[PDB]
């Protein structure tokens, strides 16, 4: 296998300049794909800025300070992908990873006891030894005894502290979903209708709060609430609405002028 990851071949969401490093932290295998993850060294050094170098990044991680899903991690190459609760008790950061409207990773700060509430999408339903229904999720976790009504495509809200599922949200029309793939990713919208093409990818037509009609493949949506009004957990600050680029340009120019 390969162990190196070149700077250019690294994902663009990590925001590492092509002039500083020739190589990048190659994410060792784990819960998330290396294309869809921020290495815990990248998180601790380039995002939280607690570490100045990579040598000062291994200092933090090996100490066991950084907790992921109520579990300390010591490897800087740990994936630590999307919808995971990261906690550093020394500073009490207690934030989760989300996708903003522009599709990038967001350190959404969480309240107290909101860290226990965590979601994960069911990707496969199978029986283990002894006729035991098992559900594996996007995090790679295997649920030994899920809800009898749980199906593939639904997300279970899972208590990290208790290590037990607490509720199920079925994938149907009229639910709140957040897209996880492509340029459409990071947008919270409402499932209006899903078109089912057997064999090929499934197309999910969505409509966000502002009324924009957008679509994507059904493998990218992630149910986040029963309805668009009420969501189980906190979302990034944009509220999942992508506004017009021309109006995006006008407002920031006005705000920059308001400083002067």
């Amino acid at each position: 296998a390969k162990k190196h990851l070149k700077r250019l071949y690294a994902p663009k969401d990590w925001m590492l300049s092509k002039l500083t490093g020739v190589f990048a932290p190659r994410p060792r295998p784990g819960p998330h794909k290396l294309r869809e993850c921020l290495p815990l060294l990248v998180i601790i050094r380039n995002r939280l800025k607690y570490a100045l170098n990579a040598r000062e990044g291994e200092m933090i991680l090996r100490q066991g300070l950084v907790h992921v899903d109520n579990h300390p991690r010591r490897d800087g190459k740990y994936p630590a992908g999307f919808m995971d609760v990261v906690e550093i008790p020394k500073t009490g950061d207690r934030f989760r990873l989300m996708y903003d409207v522009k599709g990038r990773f967001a350190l959404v700060n969480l309240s107290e006891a909101e860290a226990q509430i965590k979601l994960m999408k069911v990707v496969n339903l199978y029986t283990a030894t002894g006729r035991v229904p098992v559900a594996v999720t996007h995090d790679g976790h295997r649920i030994r005894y899920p809800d009898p009504h749980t199906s593939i495509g639904d997300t279970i809200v899972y208590n990290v502290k208790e290590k037990k599922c607490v509720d199920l949200i079925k994938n149907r029309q009229g639910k709140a979903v957040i897209v996880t793939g492509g340029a459409n990713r990071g947008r919270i919208g409402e499932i209006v209708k899903v078109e089912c093409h057997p064999g090929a990818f499934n197309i999910a037509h969505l409509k966000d709060a502002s009324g924009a009609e957008f679509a994507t493949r059904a493998a990218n949506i992630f149910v986040i609430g029963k309805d668009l009004n009420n969501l189980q957990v906190t979302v990034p600050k944009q509220q999942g609405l992508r506004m017009n680029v021309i109006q995006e340009r006008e407002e920031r120019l006005i705000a920059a002028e308001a400083r002067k």
Partner: protein, 79 residues
């Protein structure tokens, strides 16, 4: 002959003063006996718990079927 202290009999050698006594391997002190006994305990306890989740899950399946069966029997009662 067993049931004695072994650390009083091994060979010490003097260099030129310190005496060189080897580390005693396979010496199962009662601290070592504690974890070995603990090892066989959580194993049987952890498979006892697994039968509880299997038992409770079978309660979930059967209780719902019992509910649906008498519901069909209540509808036919009116008929």
């Amino acid at each position: 002959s067993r049931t004695e202290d072994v650390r009083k009999y091994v060979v010490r050698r003097r260099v030129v003063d310190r005496l060189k006594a080897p580390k005693i391997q396979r010496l199962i002190t009662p601290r070592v006996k504690a974890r070995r006994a603990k090892k066989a305990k959580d194993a049987i306890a952890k498979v006892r718990a697994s039968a509880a989740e299997r038992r409770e899950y079978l309660r979930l399946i059967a209780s719902n079927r019992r509910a649906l069966r008498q519901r069909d029997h209540s509808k036919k009662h009116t008929r």
